Amino acid sequence: PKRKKNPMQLRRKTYGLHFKERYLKLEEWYFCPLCAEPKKQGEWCRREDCRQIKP
């Protein structure tokens, strides 16, 4: 770095689909019918009901 960066240089950082996809993305979720807790798909609890039949 032979120069300091004005914000418009620091701001380009936030446009590529690398910043956006890493930080600024909401996860798709739903309520685990057994635990009533929010949950992503493909993931389950450490619990017999959640483990035999994948909620």
Binding site: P7, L10, R11, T14, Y15, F19, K20, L24
Partner: protein
């Protein structure tokens, strides 16, 4: 940033501010200059920062809540001593 194909103004109080934080206006002779004109209403109500609960994690109450947050990898040392001899 954010922007859902919608021109929400921007990132709010975030991207620009974190560039040059404003120097703190010091008191001369401990005086506050316009003290003798502005009302005495608590500053929580003057500019508008009116908060129902100012929960303070710098407290011995919430020491459990702080230790709930920090990452296990965030090792803190000198728990049971200090490098500088405290008895001097």
């Amino acid at each position: 940033f954010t922007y859902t194909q919608a021109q929400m103004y921007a990132r709010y109080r975030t991207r620009s501010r974190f560039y040059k934080r404003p120097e703190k206006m010091l008191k001369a002779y401990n005086v506050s200059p316009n003290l003798l004109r502005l009302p005495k209403v608590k500053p929580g109500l003057l500019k508008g920062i009116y908060t129902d609960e100012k929960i303070d994690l710098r407290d011995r109450e919430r020491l459990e809540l702080v230790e709930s947050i920090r990452h296990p990898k965030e090792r803190d040392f000198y728990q049971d001593h200090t490098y500088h001899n405290q008895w001097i």
